[PDB]
Amino acid sequence: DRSFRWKYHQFRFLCHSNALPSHVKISVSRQTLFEDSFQQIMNMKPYDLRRRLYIIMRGEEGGIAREWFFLLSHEVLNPMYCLFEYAGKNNYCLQINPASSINPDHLTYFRFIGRFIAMALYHGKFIDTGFTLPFYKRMLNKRPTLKDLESIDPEFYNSIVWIKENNLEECGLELYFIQDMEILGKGGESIRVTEENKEEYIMLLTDWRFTRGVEEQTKAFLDGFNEVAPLEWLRYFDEKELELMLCGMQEIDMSDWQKSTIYRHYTKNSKQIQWFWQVVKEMDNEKRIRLLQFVTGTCRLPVGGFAELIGSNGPQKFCIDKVGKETWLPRSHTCFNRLDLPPYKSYEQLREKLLYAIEET
Numbered sequence: 001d002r003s004f005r006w007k008y009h010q011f012r013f014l015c016h017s018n019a020l021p022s023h024v025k026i027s028v029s030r031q032t033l034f035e036d037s038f039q040q041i042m043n044m045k046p047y048d049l050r051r052r053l054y055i056i057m058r059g060e061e062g063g064i065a066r067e068w069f070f071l072l073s074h075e076v077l078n079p080m081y082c083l084f085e086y087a088g089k090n091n092y093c094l095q096i097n098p099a100s101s102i103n104p105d106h107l108t109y110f111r112f113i114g115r116f117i118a119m120a121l122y123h124g125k126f127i128d129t130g131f132t133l134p135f136y137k138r139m140l141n142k143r144p145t146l147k148d149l150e151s152i153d154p155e156f157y158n159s160i161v162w163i164k165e166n167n168l169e170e171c172g173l174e175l176y177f178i179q180d181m182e183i184l185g186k187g188g189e190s191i192r193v194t195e196e197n198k199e200e201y202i203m204l205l206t207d208w209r210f211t212r213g214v215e216e217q218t219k220a221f222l223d224g225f226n227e228v229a230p231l232e233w234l235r236y237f238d239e240k241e242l243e244l245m246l247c248g249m250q251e252i253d254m255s256d257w258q259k260s261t262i263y264r265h266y267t268k269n270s271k272q273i274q275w276f277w278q279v280v281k282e283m284d285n286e287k288r289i290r291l292l293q294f295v296t297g298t299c300r301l302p303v304g305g306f307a308e309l310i311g312s313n314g315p316q317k318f319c320i321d322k323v324g325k326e327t328w329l330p331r332s333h334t335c336f337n338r339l340d341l342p343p344y345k346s347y348e349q350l351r352e353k354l355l356y357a358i359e360e361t
Contacts, residue, residue, distance in 0.1 A: 004241050004286065011245075014233050015050075015122050023052035028068070030057060034075045037068075038112055041119075046227030049119050069120055073127035076113055083109060088312045093152050094130045096221075098183045098213030107220040114224010117246070122229045126248040133297060134210055136239035138218065139231060144210045146202070151297050151334045154312055156209060160202055167195060177201060183213055240293045247300050252288045254281065257318065260306035264321030273320060275347040279354055287358065294358045297334035311336050329357045 001007070024044065028036030041049070055068050077084050082100050087093035100106040120127050132152065134144040150157040163175075176190035193201055211218070222231065234242060258277060266273055280288065293299045295318065302308045309317055312335040323340035324331065330341045330353060344350035 001236055004244070007236050007241065008245065010236070011233060012124075015229075018050065020047065020050050023054050024048050025054050025056070027056040027058060030071075033071060034078075034081075037072055037116075038109070041115055042108065042112055046115060049115060049228050050122055053119075053123055065123075066125060069125045069127055072116065073120075073129045076116075077129065081109070082106075083113070087152055089314050090310050091130070092310055092312055093132060095132070095135070095152070096214040096217050098181075100214075100217055102184065107216060110217045110220035111224040114221045114226070115228045116224075117221075118225040118228035121246060127246055128300070129246075130298075130300070131243070131246075133239040133243065133293075136242040138210075139222065139225070139242060140234055140237065140239060141231070142239065144206070146206055149206060149209060153209060154335045160205065163198060164202065168193075168198070175201070177204065179205070179208055179212070181212060240290065240299070243293070243299055244289065249285065249289055249299070250301070252285060252292065252301075253305060254288075256305040256307070260309070260317055262317050262319045264319065266320060266322055272322070272341055272343055272350065275344075275350050276320065276341065276354070278347065279351045282351075287355075290358050294361070295332045295334065295339050296337050309337055329353055329361060331357070331361070 026037065026040040026044075028040065053065055055064050057064065077094070079085065082097050082102050083106070084094055085097040087095055096110075100110075103109070117127065117129075119125075134148045134152065137144050137148070146157075146160065149160065168175075174190075175193045177193070178188075178190060225231065237245070257280075263270075263273070268274075280291065283291070289299045292301075296309065302310060306318060309315070316337050318337050318339075320339045320341050322343050324342040326342045326344055326349075328342050330339060332339055341350075342353075344353060
């Protein structure tokens with residue numbers, strides 16, 4: 001497929017080609033901002049949202065749309081509503097809340113957020129909600145993979161990766177094709193698990209973890225998003241690019257990044273890292289973000305730059321270490337912000353290998 005720049009352009013014209021006359025009024029007070037928006041947009045028909053956007057606060061003027069999109073994207077994350085939760089510590093790994101059914105109209109709210117996210121894309125405006133790549137995969141009809149579990153849920157990854165090797169007979173646990181779900185207070189048989197059908201079991205579990213409890217809500221969100229902007233229009237994008245379009249690119253500070261990097265079996269004076277920073281310098285900004293996405297799981301820096309960078313287990317700085325065979329592609333552990341970089345024999349190989357890994361893996 002083509003360069004992102006080309007894909008964005010092709011997406012833009014598809015939006016513009018399908019744009020429609022006149023405009024839409026959505027007026028909201030800053031206290032009532034979430035409720036207002038809700039009622040207004042749900043009472044509007046999805047198509048009408050592709051018209052020109054006129055937003056009024058009741059009070060003053062000013063610019064106003066970018067705020068509205070920004071404020072409302074933060075306001076939906078308020079745990080007060082039980083729509084979205086964080087799997088990890090300190091706002092790590094945003095996801096739909098299984099206990100969202102606590103409010104009986106929750107699906108209409110997810111449908112509302114759907115439309116809202118589609119408006120942001122369709123009208124060229126950015127949000128800072130903080131969805132994770134697997135959320136974006138599902139918007140692109142991509143099955144989340146085994147490595148995406150590591151991004152959201154490290155302990156569950158380790159127990160699956162352990163299950164993958166070695167009989168398991170040297171074990172005392174049956175591991176039936178069933179899973180318990182503790183929510184708000186709570187073909188399909190126990191089955192036999194075998195060396196053969198571990199590979200079936202693992203898939204079903206990998207699928208299950210991402211989908212568990214958030215099935216009608218995710219459907220609600222997409223039928224959401226679709227009513228306004230068809231998902232077909234996204235088909236050529238990958239998840240990292242989708243995130244990019246919704247969050248926006250920003251200037252990476254190469255100094256901040258290099259000062260705030262730690263090491264395992266390596267040093268700044270070591271030759272792999274000298275080459276590493278040489279290729280990162282050699283990159284344009286679109287590739288630097290791609291690298292950051294590859295290593296951290298996102299294209300957005302935390303407030304305070306590379307020093308304040310968080311993983312799954314609290315504060316976790318960007319780190320490279322001598323792991324993997326040479327003649328291997330470097331691989332990330334996004335939950336720890338770690339990059340396994342093999343001790344490649346020359347700069348040339350490493351440079352070649354790093355670029356492909358960032359772009360293809």
